[PDB]
């Protein structure tokens, strides 16, 4: 709910996201409600209306630039490359997920290849754990990196456009 989480110039990749711990009391949530710039504001465990008066011990905010068609994978309870090998949410989730398009900042005409995702892991990720280790994996008869970079072009559809996703955790 802070300004520096949602207005950061550089956002983290999905495989190595940025978690920010918030323990203040300045949380009005009216900007998030009435911004009308969020493509996804659906969340679970709370009604998203009694959020202003309720208090919590700590608030954890994440940040990734996943593609448009894997914003739905940030929900709990389904598969997908982001949901399995990247950021994974537990079945009992008591936070909120916010996402918006970032074609003007994270896409270019020649392509923006600065954002990476993990294509394969040895085992599925447990909820709320992160791995940054650069390793190669085996396909066919060749060894190649497990981190593939997103191809973010300006002349691409909404499913292939960058989306800055901020996930609150209470």
């Amino acid at each position: 709910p802070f300004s520096e989480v949602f207005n950061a110039t550089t956002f983290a990749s999905v495989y190595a996201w940025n978690r920010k711990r918030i323990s203040n009391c300045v949380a009005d949530y009216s900007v998030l409600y009435n911004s009308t710039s969020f493509s996804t504001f659906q969340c679970y465990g709370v009604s998203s209306t009694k959020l202003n008066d309720l208090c919590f011990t700590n608030v954890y905010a994440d940040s990734f630039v996943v593609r448009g068609d894997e914003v739905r994978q940030i929900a709990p309870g389904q598969t997908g490359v982001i949901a399995d090998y990247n950021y994974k949410l537990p079945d009992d989730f008591t936070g909120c997920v916010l996402a918006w398009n970032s074609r003007n900042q994270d896409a270019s005409t020649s392509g923006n290849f600065n954002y990476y995702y993990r294509i394969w892991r040895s085992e599925k990720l447990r909820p709320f754990e992160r791995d940054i280790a650069h390793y190669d994996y085996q396909v066919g008869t060749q060894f190649k990196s497990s981190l593939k970079n997103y191809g973010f072009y300006s002349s691409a559809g909404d499913s292939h456009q960058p989306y800055r996703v901020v996930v609150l955790s209470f």
Partner: protein
């Protein structure tokens, strides 16, 4: 671990590295096609080189996964697509020779010229020059010059290139574990359904034979009507019983009969539909045309055009100094990028072409959710079938009336529907025997059922028997008449145009049944039909994830190709043609030719190879020269190329006739040639050391 997991990992990595290269290649191709320059050729060449090298390499790894140990259908289909096409087993010199042969054939087709007999400096290319004559001229002799100069100055160049091309392509297809190149072309329609046996590659041949048998009577009646109308124009050139000459069919090859419409129109006093003036009025531009197409597709429930479609597509010719390719194409660039490149004029043809290309784009965004290998049509006919059935629904006069382009005072009588159905049939029914016969000839050329010494003989036998079209000039093995077509000289399969029409009219009948249409099928509009659009979107959503038989059964209720919807569409035209062809002869004989009545039959009675045939042609030319000098006091330089030989038995008999120099349409009368033979019989019979009894000269 298990091979399914390894195949899934390989396919995931291939997709992740493949949308990248496909999108980069598509962007380079778009930058060339909307901005033609030498700088943009190299970028496309580089991007295509990277994509092709990646594809052949990944097919080489893809061959390492055995298909018999995969249970998931999607992985099976993706690996089948990857393993079917890749790097051939051909050696580097043979592959270089094949590439050089293909480039030579394309260059000969694109740069061949035909020069006038009177003006050697007036040489005409095919696309602006000879196509205009073949589509617009009503002169028998000019059309004969254009038809005979082509296939002689171009097809004779393409004959040895095609002879080497057949061998090289058959070797390449045998390297892919196929019987020949025809089997490799028929691999598109092969499926493995879960329930029962699937579609085979021989089943395609059996099905197209059955479909042609079913369409034979309607084509026979249309042929009889066109012959009766083409007897008025060109009198004393068409037999009432025989085949139609190949150079009077509206184009160079007789592929479409649409240019015969001014000659074969019923009820010429009735004006046809032409709303082009109504869009010159009311301020219509290209944007209005494409917005109306988008409105039509929204009316059935299909999605809107994307925001990037309206920004990135080239809907008009650029006002600045940018050279573009003015061919209407719908582009699926990848990563959700759909564009249309077309130079839209304010015309009805451009309106219907916009609806066609928007149907292509709708198919693309429907199957965009599939994996990259499966993002195509169900077979090669489905895309064009969807485009033509959208164009069929849009072009109805009721749709134009509710669009405002047609005045409410316009009344649809029975005469206007006959004109519309005949104009449709000259493009739809007239092209089906030609397509079937050309694909049949190519299939038995690749299979080996036609030997190399019978190519033209079998070509003009099946042209007479199947299409009902006779050649105006006899053609020996020096000619290559199929190679004079674009698709044959540029290595393009042709059966997609055959299957497109059948699938298109099947889809039309299904969607008009769903839309609760009660009238005749040619007056059907699927606008505002959310059920028809729902069924169509269920069809288009599965691109190649399942068999095309299952998709066809899902949309039309039948697993097989059925031409019954096509015959039901043209039923009023069939009834009218049956009523008109009561005083005419329906059908044709394969014996009449334009040169048949004036030819003299020569019997050989006894080493008569091609050299003795050249000597005989020279003797006949000398006798012609002597007769014309000593009888009519005229000098005419008859040559061996002016003596045409037909019905050549290897050593038994043949027929010959003489044509004039500088005029291939001027066949010398048979009495004059007989008098020339009887005038100079001594030299002709002394050139081969024989008497007059052995050469009968009947």
């Amino acid at each position: 671990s298990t091979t399914e997991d390894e195949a899934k990992k390989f396919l995931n990595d291939f997709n992740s590295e493949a949308e990248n290269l496909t999108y980069q290649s598509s962007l380079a191709s778009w930058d060339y096609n909307t901005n033609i320059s030498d700088e943009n050729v190299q970028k496309m060449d580089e991007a295509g080189a990277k994509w092709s090298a990646f594809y052949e390499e990944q097919s080489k790894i893809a061959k390492n996964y055995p298909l018999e140990e995969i249970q998931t259908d999607i992985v099976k289909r993706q690996l089948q697509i990857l393993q079917q096409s890749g790097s051939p087993v051909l050696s580097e010199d043979k592959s270089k020779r094949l590439n050089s042969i293909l480039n030579a054939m394309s260059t000969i087709y694109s740069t061949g010229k035909v020069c006038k007999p009177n003006n050697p400096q007036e040489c005409l290319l095919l696309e602006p020059g000879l196509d205009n004559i073949m589509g617009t001229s009503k002169d028998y002799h000019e059309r004969l010059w254009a038809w005979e100069g082509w296939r002689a100055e171009v097809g004779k160049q393409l004959r040895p290139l095609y002879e080497e091309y057949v061998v090289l392509k058959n070797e390449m297809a045998r390297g892919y574990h196929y019987e020949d190149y025809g089997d490799y072309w028929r691999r598109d329609y092969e499926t493995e359904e879960s329930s029962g046996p699937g579609y085979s590659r021989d089943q395609l041949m059996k099905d197209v034979d059955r479909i042609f048998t079913e369409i034979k009577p309607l084509y026979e009646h249309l042929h009889a009507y066109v012959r009766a109308k083409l007897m008025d124009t060109y009198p004393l050139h068409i037999s009432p019983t025989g085949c139609l000459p190949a150079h009077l069919l509206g184009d160079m090859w007789g592929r479409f009969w649409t240019n015969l419409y001014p000659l074969t129109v019923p009820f010429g006093q009735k004006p046809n539909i032409d709303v082009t003036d109504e869009m010159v009025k009311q301020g219509w531009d290209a944007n209005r045309i494409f917005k109306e197409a988008e409105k039509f597709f929204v009316s059935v429930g299909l999605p809107n055009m994307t925001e990037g479609f309206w920004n990135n597509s080239m809907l008009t010719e650029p006002g600045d100094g940018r050279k573009v390719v003015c061919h209407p194409t719908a582009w699926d660039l990848g990563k959700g990028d759909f564009r249309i490149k077309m130079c839209t004029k304010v015309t009805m043809e451009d309106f219907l072409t916009a609806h066609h290309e928007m149907g292509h784009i709708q198919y693309d965004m429907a199957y965009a959710s599939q994996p990259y290998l499966l993002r195509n049509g169900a077979n090669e006919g489905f895309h064009e079938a969807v485009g033509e059935v959208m164009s069929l629904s849009v072009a109805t006069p009721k749709h134009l009336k509710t669009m405002g382009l047609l005045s409410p005072d316009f009344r649809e009588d029975d005469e206007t529907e006959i004109n519309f159905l005949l104009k449709q049939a000259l493009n739809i029914v007239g092209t089906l025997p030609f397509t079937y016969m050309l694909e049949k000839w190519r299939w038995m050329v690749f299979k080996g059922e036609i030997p190399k010494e019978e190519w033209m003989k079998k070509w003009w036998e099946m042209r007479r028997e199947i299409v009902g079209v006779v050649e105006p000039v006899p053609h020996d093995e020096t000619y290559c008449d199929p190679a004079s077509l674009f698709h044959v000289a540029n290595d393009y399969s042709f059966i997609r145009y055959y299957t497109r029409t059948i699938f298109e009219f099947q889809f039309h009948e299904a969607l008009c049944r769903i839309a609760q249409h009660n009238g005749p099928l040619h007056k059907c509009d699927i606008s505002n039909s959310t059920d028809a659009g729902k069924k169509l979107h269920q069809m288009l959503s599965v691109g190649k994830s399942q068999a095309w038989t299952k998709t066809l059964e899902d949309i039309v209720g039948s697993r097989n190709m059925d031409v019954g919807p096509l015959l039901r569409y043209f039923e009023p035209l069939y009834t009218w043609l049956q009523e008109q062809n009561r005083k005419s002869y329906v059908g044709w004989n394969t014996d009449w030719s334009p040169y048949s009545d004036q030819s003299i039959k020569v019997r050989i009675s006894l080493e008569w190879n091609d050299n003795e045939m050249y000597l005989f042609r020279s003797s006949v030319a000398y006798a012609m020269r002597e007769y014309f000098l000593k009888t009519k006091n005229q000098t005419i330089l008859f040559g061996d190329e002016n003596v045409w030989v037909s019905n050549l038995k290897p050593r038994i008999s043949f027929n010959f006739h003489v044509t004039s120099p500088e005029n291939v349409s001027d066949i010398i009368p048979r009495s004059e040639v007989e008098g020339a033979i009887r005038m100079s019989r001594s030299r002709i019979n002394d050139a081969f050391r024989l008497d007059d009894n052995s050469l009968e000269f009947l």
